[PDB]
Amino acid sequence: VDNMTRILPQQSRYISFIKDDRFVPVRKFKGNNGVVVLRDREPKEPVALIETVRQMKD
């Protein structure tokens, strides 16, 4: 499943961040919907990003 798409509370239970990717949460998944902070293992690589409207303002 892609990021930034509707995850229900009953699909939240069956979540796993994959180990292929270089994103692992800083501290284990909430277990429910909301904003989850990721640690990037390697911050030197380019990342495909969606630049936030917030970033534009700041």
């Binding site: 798409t5 800083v26 909430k30 909301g34 904003v35 902070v37 990721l38 936030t52 917030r54």
Partner: protein
């Protein structure tokens, strides 16, 4: 929460801090956050923390989400 943030003053990492504050702004009352920033200022706390806790991030992240991902069937409205 005020004391938690004082311990966090020396454990400060971009990731860490974002984690605590992102967790707090979502569930926690609009009123609770308003008073909370007020006191953090008087501890002398950096402006970053204060911006996360204004609620500005999360509101922006949600707007985008719903906008792109819309599943409206237009015949219903018609």
């Amino acid at each position: 929460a005020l004391q938690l943030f004082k311990k966090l003053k020396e454990e400060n990492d971009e990731g860490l801090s974002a984690q605590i504050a992102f967790d707090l702004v979502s569930s926690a009352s609009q009123q609770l956050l308003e008073i909370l920033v007020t006191e953090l200022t008087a501890q002398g706390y950096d402006p970053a923390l204060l911006n996360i806790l204004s609620g500005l991030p999360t509101c922006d992240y949600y707007n985008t989400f719903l906008l792109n991902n819309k599943n409206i069937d237009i015949g219903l409205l018609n």
